Structure formats: C-alpha cells, structure tokens
Design a protein around this nucleic acid. Structure first.
Ligand SMILES: [K+]
Ligand SMILES: [K+]
Ligand SMILES: [K+]
Ligand SMILES: [K+]
Ligand SMILES: [K+]
Ligand SMILES: [K+]
Ligand SMILES: [K+]
Ligand SMILES: [K+]
Ligand SMILES: [K+]
Ligand SMILES: [Mg+2]
Ligand SMILES: [Mg+2]
Ligand SMILES: [Mg+2]
Ligand SMILES: [Mg+2]
Ligand SMILES: [Mg+2]
Ligand SMILES: [Mg+2]
Ligand SMILES: [Mg+2]
Ligand SMILES: [Mg+2]
Ligand SMILES: [Mg+2]
Ligand SMILES: [Mg+2]
Ligand SMILES: [Mg+2]
Ligand SMILES: [Mg+2]
Ligand SMILES: [Mg+2]
Ligand SMILES: [Mg+2]
Ligand SMILES: [Mg+2]
Ligand SMILES: [Mg+2]
Ligand SMILES: [Mg+2]
Ligand SMILES: [Mg+2]
Ligand SMILES: [Mg+2]
Ligand SMILES: [Mg+2]
Ligand SMILES: [Mg+2]
Ligand SMILES: [Mg+2]
Ligand SMILES: [Mg+2]
Ligand SMILES: [Mg+2]
Ligand SMILES: [Mg+2]
Ligand SMILES: [Mg+2]
Ligand SMILES: [Mg+2]
Ligand SMILES: [Mg+2]
Ligand SMILES: [Mg+2]
Ligand SMILES: [Mg+2]
Ligand SMILES: [Mg+2]
Ligand SMILES: [Mg+2]
Ligand SMILES: [Mg+2]
Ligand SMILES: [Mg+2]
Ligand SMILES: [Mg+2]
Ligand SMILES: [Mg+2]
Ligand SMILES: [Mg+2]
Ligand code: NA
Ligand code: NA
Ligand code: NA
Lengths: 48, 272
RNA sequence: CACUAGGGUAAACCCGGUGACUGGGGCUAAGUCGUAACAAGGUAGCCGUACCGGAAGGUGCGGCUGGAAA
RNA sequence: ACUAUAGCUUUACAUUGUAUUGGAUACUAACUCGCGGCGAGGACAGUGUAUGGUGGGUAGUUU
RNA sequence: UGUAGGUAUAAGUAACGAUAAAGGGGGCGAGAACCCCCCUCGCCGAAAGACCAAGGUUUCCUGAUCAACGCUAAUCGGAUCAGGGUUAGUCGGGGCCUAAGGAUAAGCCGAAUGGCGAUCCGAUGGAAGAACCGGUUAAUAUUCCGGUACUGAUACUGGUGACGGAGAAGCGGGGCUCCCAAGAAAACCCGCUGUUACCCGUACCGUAAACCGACACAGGUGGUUGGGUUGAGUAUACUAAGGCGCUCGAGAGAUUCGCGGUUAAGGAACUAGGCAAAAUGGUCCUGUAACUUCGGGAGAAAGGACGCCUGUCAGGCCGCAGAAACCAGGCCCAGGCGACUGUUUAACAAAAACACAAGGCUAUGCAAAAAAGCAAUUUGAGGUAUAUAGUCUGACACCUGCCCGGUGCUGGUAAAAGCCCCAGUAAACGGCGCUAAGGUAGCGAAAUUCCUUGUCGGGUAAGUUCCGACCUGCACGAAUGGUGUAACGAUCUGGGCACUGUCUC
RNA sequence: ACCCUUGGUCAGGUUGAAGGUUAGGUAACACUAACUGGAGGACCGAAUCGGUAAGCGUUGAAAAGCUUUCGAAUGAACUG
C-alpha cells in the first residue's frame, strides 16, 4: 500500500530548508532554539 | 432556437440545448481574447469563501466594450459569436477608424449592419445613446448607472428594460425585476433587447453538464450533523426547523438590503 | 437415403370455463331523504364543456327557443 | 436553563456648516462616490464614544 | 499490571516469507545440496525481457577476508578492508521566457510580531544554436578512437508563437469533417583560411534484494518499448531473444488442515439464505413475449450448423466427443426501495443513505445580497434579475385538499427602536380534536399493524416468509411530497427451469 | 479532503442519435424507403481505478493483505 512518506527533494527543501526557515520570524525562532540546544543538523539542508 | 435531444440514453432523455442558429463564426478575435484563470470560490487568502465552484471547461475572457465612448464613429457588424463567459451572444465590430470591439448582441442585430454611439446616433437597434436622446417608450438594455462608468444594468440573455417617462435630469425606467427607478438622463443605454432569449428553455439533462459548467454538488443542511449546520441532526428524517443558513440567517422573507441605503430615494416601486 | 401419418417438445394465437373480491343494468313492491322537471313549477328551460356536492342537482362560459312577461 | 458576548439595529454627542420659512425646505464648503478638473450626492451617510433592543452565531457554567 | 541491566520458562518447540523444480558430470577447496564450467530438466516471455524519470548514493569492477551481516552451510554475496572506475561545442540540465503561486515598489491597513498590494522569482509548459556509422574496457561511451558531418562566436505599431473533444482519412529423404462544454502566458521570430567552443550530470539499482513499507518484506511506484504461432485483440495458450528455478534441506507418505481432481443412485431433501460449487459461454443463420417514456425491453426466451478429404453447397472419411485445449452470458416469472450513470463510513456498514438533472419559496438594482478577514482587501464577478445567493423537494405521469389559532418572519434608555395592537404569510416550522381547522384525492396488517402466524384466495404433501384482496389505519396521507411508473441495481425479498458432494453419506 | 496551474493515459469488439444524399409525396413544408453518418455521464471486455461475495490469513508474507468472484472502464474518468 501507499505509505505516508513519498520523497521529493524539491518539496523537502521548499518546506523545511534553510531559506524557508530564514524567511519567517518563527522559523528564525526554530533556528535559534536548535543552535542553543547545539544540534549538529540545523535544518534538512545540512543532510546528505 | 433550441434542440431537443432524442432519448437514446437516460442522461439525454430530458436534455434541451440551444440550436446555435445565430452564431456566424467559430473562432474569436485573437487581439480581444485572453486566457482566464479559475477560482474554486477561494479568495486571496486561499480560503473557500464561496462553495459549489470548481472545475469545468477551460475558458478565455473576451473584452466587451460596455462603455462605448467612440462617439460618432460608425461601426460594421462582422460576426455573431459564442461567449462562454455570459448567457448572451456577442458581436464583433469594425470601426471606420480601424479599431475592433465586442458588444453584447441585441435581438435583431444582423451581420452587415451599422452601429453608432453618441447623441447624434439614430435610435436604431444596437445604437448607444444618452437616455436624454432616446424616445419615451423604447425597449432598451445595457444601461449605465453613472455617466461614463459603463453599462451595468440590463445585460443577461433575453432581458430588457423600458423607458417609461422622463422628469428633467432623471428618466424613469422599468427594470427586468419589475422595479421602477430613476436614472440620470446623461447615462447611456443601447436600443433593443438582449438576444438569445431561448437560453431559459435549456435543460442540462444530467449532472455531468453542471460539472462542465463549473458547479460542484450542493449538500442539503438537513442531512448534516448539528456541528456542521443548524438544520442538521436527528434520528431519521426531520424537517430541520425554520430554514436558515450555517450562520443562522433566516431563509424565508427576511430582508437584507441595508435600511439606510441612499439609493432608495431613486426607487419608486420595489419588486424582487 | 429422401417422402409421410402418427408421436413427443416448446412457444405464441384463437376459442371456452372457473375464481377471493369488486361494479353497472332490468323488473317488483314500497321502507327512508328530499322536491329536480311539467304553470314564469315558485332561480325560464334545454345543448356543449369544466369544477363541486347524501341524491335528485348547483355554479361558471358560450349557444338555442323546443320560453313566459313585456 | 443561568450568565456573558461577536454581529445586527435604535437614539444622543462628535466629525458638522450656511440661509429662508420654528419644521421642514434649500444651498455648498466638511465628508462620500464616478470619469479623466468635470460630474453625482451632501451635512445625510460612514466612523468614534454612550445608550436601549436583538443575539445557542460563539463562550463559560449549572442542572 | 513499579524502572534498568542480566538470565530463565514455554523449547530444541513455532518458524526458515508465495507448491516455477530440479538431476548429473567435472573444477577449486581443509571443508561443497547451495560456489565456478558443461549437459539435461523446468518457469516468465505486453515479462519475471529492454529503456527514461523520481528516489537511493559507490551498492559498479578487481584483489584479499568469512569474525559479524545472509533466517542453513558457504570456497559465494548488494557483506568487511584496500585499490580502481563516470571523459560531451551537438545527449540531459542550466543559462532565456512566462503559469498557479510567492516576494516585493508606489501606496493601503494594523497594540507589537506584521497583513495586503503591479516589477521580479517560480516548470509540471514555451525557446533552446547544433549528427550518425563502426570499433574498443574488468568496470564509460551519441562523451574515447577511426570516418563522416553539422552548429556558434572570433582574427583576415500590426502578424507569428498560440493551443479543445470525437471520428474518418492520407525409417525415408498531417491536415479534413462534426460537435459544444468554446479549448494558457511570455520570451522569441516576422512585418512596419585559421583559432576557438565555458559550467553541471554521466558509475550502479530503478514493476526493485539498492525507491516508499523497522526486514534481502507475497504490498505500492509516473512514462516508453514489448518478436513468432493463435486469435477481434496489448485477451488466452505455447515459445524465440533475454531473464530466471524465488538463500534451508533429506526421508517418510498416520491423523488433521490448505489448495485442487473424480464420484453409484437421488437432485436443495442442505441451510437463516442454493452460501459455495456445478451449470451457461464462441461465430454464423433462423426466431424473439408482457410492458413502454417508442429509445427500449433484447444477446429476451427458443432452435439449427461447425472437424478432415474430394468436386463443381453436394459426395465421402474418422472419433465417445469437431466452439475441440486455454478462453468464453445461466435463464424465466413476481414484489419492496431508489428514476437513471455516479458518491460514501482509508481499517467490520456500498445501501433504501449522499449527489443528481429538474420544481418551488425567499433574498438581492450593483461598493448587490451573501461569504472570509481587526482592517485593508479578496471571493460573489468583472458577472448584472433568463443573474447570483440561502433553503426544502428530487427524472417522469396524474396530482398536490383544510387551518394564520401557537411559534417564526413581513408590514403599519442614555443625554427612538422596541413593546402593544391590527393585518399578512403554510412548496414557512407546525396542526388536521372544546375548537384555528376536526384528513380531500390516493393508498393501507404497509421498510408504518401492538394484538398477530388478523381473515379470505393462490402457490406446496405440508408456507409464521411471498403474492392478490378485505379494512376497527395501536400509530398512512399529499414538495420532512401522495399514488404510480418503462429503463436501470455487486440493493432487499418470493417462486420456477438448468445444474450440481449443499445434503442422504 | 477539496481547489488551482501545467502535462499524460485509456487493447479490442458492438450498437447506431442528430445531420446528409437519393427516390416517392405536397400548393409548399411536412412525411415514407434505401444508402451514408458516427452521437452517447451508451453496451461487452484487457491495461487501470475501485472493493461486491466466499475462502484463506489472524505472535500474518502484510499495523488491512492474498486467491477466486465481482463493479466501472470517453468520463461527475484515471493519473504525474
Ligand atoms: K442537495
Ligand atoms: K447550533
Ligand atoms: K350557433
Ligand atoms: K495484571
Ligand atoms: K548507464
Ligand atoms: K451420475
Ligand atoms: K428446506
Ligand atoms: K413483503
Ligand atoms: K498504478
Ligand atoms: Mg447522517
Ligand atoms: Mg421519526
Ligand atoms: Mg321545483
Ligand atoms: Mg325551476
Ligand atoms: Mg359551489
Ligand atoms: Mg453552550
Ligand atoms: Mg473553569
Ligand atoms: Mg501483564
Ligand atoms: Mg509444546
Ligand atoms: Mg511466521
Ligand atoms: Mg514446522
Ligand atoms: Mg522488467
Ligand atoms: Mg558486484
Ligand atoms: Mg574474491
Ligand atoms: Mg550463517
Ligand atoms: Mg565488494
Ligand atoms: Mg521573469
Ligand atoms: Mg554498463
Ligand atoms: Mg518486493
Ligand atoms: Mg505502447
Ligand atoms: Mg503478441
Ligand atoms: Mg497474457
Ligand atoms: Mg453423484
Ligand atoms: Mg432442515
Ligand atoms: Mg454463488
Ligand atoms: Mg440508485
Ligand atoms: Mg451504480
Ligand atoms: Mg469500513
Ligand atoms: Mg464493505
Ligand atoms: Mg429527499
Ligand atoms: Mg421521495
Ligand atoms: Mg423461506
Ligand atoms: Mg400483501
Ligand atoms: Mg409537507
Ligand atoms: Mg459507459
Ligand atoms: Mg481488470
Ligand atoms: Mg465494462
Ligand atoms: Na530510469
Ligand atoms: Na539521481
Ligand atoms: Na445455479
């Protein structure tokens, strides 16, 4: 059967990418919280 | 005219469509058309503000000259054409100046005729005149509300209005709805009634034709749950109480025109 | 091996019968309810058509005199 | 059911002026709308404050 | 039913993941059912063969290794380690253009954060400036090489673009026609002899053991191609090319289960119910009823022929059987509901529920009513009363009675609304027993009837179900529509024929 | 789930609407017969989409499947 995750790199970057996060005040809030926690993977842009 | 379909299928048993007997051309004028995008009833925030809209055949918009400001320039009627955007047909005009325009096709206007706009124009079918220049008792359509703003009033297929009398700066006009009201005598109107009066005799026959025309199914309120509609709920069928909308607005005889609207000073008799 | 009377099969037709139940009609008496027509029969009568009434009937529209009174 | 409330509606004050004959009529200059200054309205309308109605549309609860 | 770690019990038990299948001979090795080579056998073959895209990311090739991983072992591997491997002026992309949408300018709105708002961004579309043939690697090739070519740079304001659907057609030897539901934008493009050729991708998997499903998982995954015989066919059966035998085996052949085959005589006696199975099935030629909205019903039903050889449909030949296997409608009579094709409870309900074409009522004269939003603004609609919106009814036919009393709806205080009163409105909600009116037509033991298996008739040997009637309708009834209705239904329900392991058993 | 923009897909067979032409017919239209035509939320049926009925599975191969059967299959279709 069809499962919930149907991968698309363009959609992944458009939805959760670094520039998508920086475009909004709440996205920058997410980035600041992740930096404060010390995540090695800031966004899905860091992954490969 | 109309064409009644023979009952070869159940979806065609009750189908009546137009005969398309007035159309003289099949291709629109390229410089006067543009592709039109659809809304699903969604506004600029993306939320569906109007229901039962969606899909349908792709359409192109035709530029209709509702203003007719080329006063004194004669024009020749070239073609009568189908317009997907309105119930009436449209007419292509060639001005002696070399311009082109589309107008609402009045009843009785034939390919090869001449039309004109402005005060000096003869009051013939298809001509656009200020109401001060139209003889009293003439059947008219495409009536301006403010001078220079373009025709707004009588535009649907088969509809017409009548100039009953004039009273100085205002004339008195009887509307398709039966309202009698005063219109500034500097506003423009076109002589004749809108064509395609057999448009009201057409029957879709099946649900697919409504889908082609771009309508989506409409659900009754009594077959919903109370959380969705005030008229929903109950075990088995129930009447739903007093008819009202999702926001509780009564649907039988409650008036919604603003009681202090200024235009009511120009409305002599009312009828809806 | 054809030909065929006769046999079986199916259908469909025609001719008859019977059937829970359900409708007119004729005749005889006269129980019941009214008085529609015959006199201008007490709202002149009748013809066609439509609607309606426990029933004769009533009313609308057009027609006729096979109607008085005038 | 109790109590509120969005919305709708009424009136007063502000925005808000002039003249005639007060209670209406008229005016244009506030204000509103249309066409590209001109036209159409007009002290109304809309908006703010206050106020009386209405209000399972929404909410908090009781039973 | 406390938490972490460790170890037990069930137990050497369930299970080792599609019943497409394996046998032998050699090789290598300490070790072989499984690795390598050969022969034979079997499976797919509109695929289980060959390609493009998404997605993955070195899984590709070679040498070492067999600890762990591989549902067994392994000398093998998509495993571990190391080395190697992807070559473009012409292929794909990007560079150029715009769609939905997004970000913005001038401006608008707004406690803040901000929300809007026409140029720019943005392909899934439009342009691209431009080839093939052959050979070659362990692993790349239109990229490397040999020919053959071509393309781009460089030094001597009206037209096009630019657009739909459907159908015909060009042993022996493209346009055309028809139709209504009327079929993007912008760039662009028209008219008015050398010397060079940049950047990114290129391996490998890709109906899958490499993607999405925790797995080397019987599922899901867009596009192209897809030989021969048979056929109407891309169905079906067999089979080339190519690819596979599905990563546990060997014996044995109890009970029992799963998937299949046959069955005397009977033939629905089974069961809630013919559930399941059986039966029907092709082409051509005859022949087709009630009813009907005149289209249908209809492939109704019911019959006949069919192979091979010879001769211009007849004569002959063979078999139990000539539609030959595979493939391939069961039919009829009569009811309820819903006109019909559709939609729905992803994962126990597909229906009589929803929708529907169509009817009515009500609102709305245009900054329309109405819907979102604090607002700006947007939808409605760039439509204009033959239009838009709210609401009920639900094709069609014949129709749709009485009530305005009740409840809704419409009219005529702070510093006038209302309320009253009167009038109206039932295809408004609602009612149809002292009253506002006391149920018209049509139906009726009904998807409604408690009593109740009501009573009578039919059907059966026997009928609480079914069909036709009756009417004291517990408690039908006219747009929360009444009564019918051809056609339609993986609907509910009754009776027949065919047929049968459903049953006697 | 619904919508918006831009693309793609639907073997094969059957039926035979409008319209047209030709004969008759009429004052003229109508109207009859043949040929043609190829419409349709039309029919049968692969791909495909869905999920009727039964069997199986129920520490499953699968946190919803498989086999047979069955609905739709030019459209209110399916799909990137
Ligand atoms: K509806
Ligand atoms: K409610
Ligand atoms: K006469
Ligand atoms: K316990
Ligand atoms: K390759
Ligand atoms: K037997
Ligand atoms: K029995
Ligand atoms: K019954
Ligand atoms: K698919
Ligand atoms: Mg419900
Ligand atoms: Mg009830
Ligand atoms: Mg008498
Ligand atoms: Mg008398
Ligand atoms: Mg009477
Ligand atoms: Mg509450
Ligand atoms: Mg609390
Ligand atoms: Mg426990
Ligand atoms: Mg045990
Ligand atoms: Mg297991
Ligand atoms: Mg076992
Ligand atoms: Mg393959
Ligand atoms: Mg390898
Ligand atoms: Mg090795
Ligand atoms: Mg092992
Ligand atoms: Mg390796
Ligand atoms: Mg651009
Ligand atoms: Mg290769
Ligand atoms: Mg798999
Ligand atoms: Mg193909
Ligand atoms: Mg083939
Ligand atoms: Mg096949
Ligand atoms: Mg037997
Ligand atoms: Mg029994
Ligand atoms: Mg069965
Ligand atoms: Mg149905
Ligand atoms: Mg259906
Ligand atoms: Mg379910
Ligand atoms: Mg189900
Ligand atoms: Mg209904
Ligand atoms: Mg109904
Ligand atoms: Mg029974
Ligand atoms: Mg009965
Ligand atoms: Mg009713
Ligand atoms: Mg169909
Ligand atoms: Mg299929
Ligand atoms: Mg089919
Ligand atoms: Na590929
Ligand atoms: Na890739
Ligand atoms: Na059977």
């Amino acid at each position: 059967m069809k499962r919930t995750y149907q991968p698309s790199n363009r959609k992944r970057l458009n939805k959760h990418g670094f520039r998508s996060r920086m475009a909004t005040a709440n996205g920058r809030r997410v980035l600041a919280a992740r930096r404060a926690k010390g995540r090695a993977k800031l966004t899905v842009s860091d992954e490969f | 005219g109309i064409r009644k379909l023979k009952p070869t299928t159940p979806g065609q048993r009750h189908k009546v469509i137009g005969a398309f007997d007035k159309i003289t051309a099949s291709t629109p004028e390229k410089s006067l058309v543009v592709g039109k995008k659809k809304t699903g009833g969604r506004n600029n925030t993306g939320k569906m503000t109007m229901r039962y809209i969606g899909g349908g055949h792709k359409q192109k918009y035709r530029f209709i000259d509702f203003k007719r400001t080329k006063d004194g320039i004669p024009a020749t009627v070239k073609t009568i054409e189908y317009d997907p955007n309105r119930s009436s047909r449209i007419a292509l005009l060639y001005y002696a100046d070399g311009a082109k325009a589309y107008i609402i096709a009045p009843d009785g206007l034939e390919v090869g005729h001449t039309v004109m706009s402005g005060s000096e124009a003869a009051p013939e079918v298809g001509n656009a005149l200020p109401l001060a220049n139209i003889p009293v008792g003439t059947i008219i359509h495409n009536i301006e509300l403010r001078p220079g703003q373009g025709a707004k009033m009588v535009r649907s297929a088969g509809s017409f209005a009548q100039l009953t009398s004039r009273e100085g700066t205002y004339v008195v006009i009887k509307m398709p709805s039966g309202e009698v009201r005063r219109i500034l005598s500097t506003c423009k109107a076109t002589i004749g009634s809108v064509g395609n009066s057999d448009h009201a005799l057409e029957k879709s026959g099946k649900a697919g034709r409504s889908r082609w025309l771009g309508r989506r199914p409409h659900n009754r309120g009594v077959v919903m749950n109370p959380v969705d509609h005030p008229m929903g709920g109950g075990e088995g069928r129930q009447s739903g109480g007093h008819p009202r909308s999702r926001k509780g607005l009564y649907a039988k005889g409650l008036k919604t025109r603003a009681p202090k609207k200024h235009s009511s000073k120009y409305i002599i008799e009312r009828r809806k």
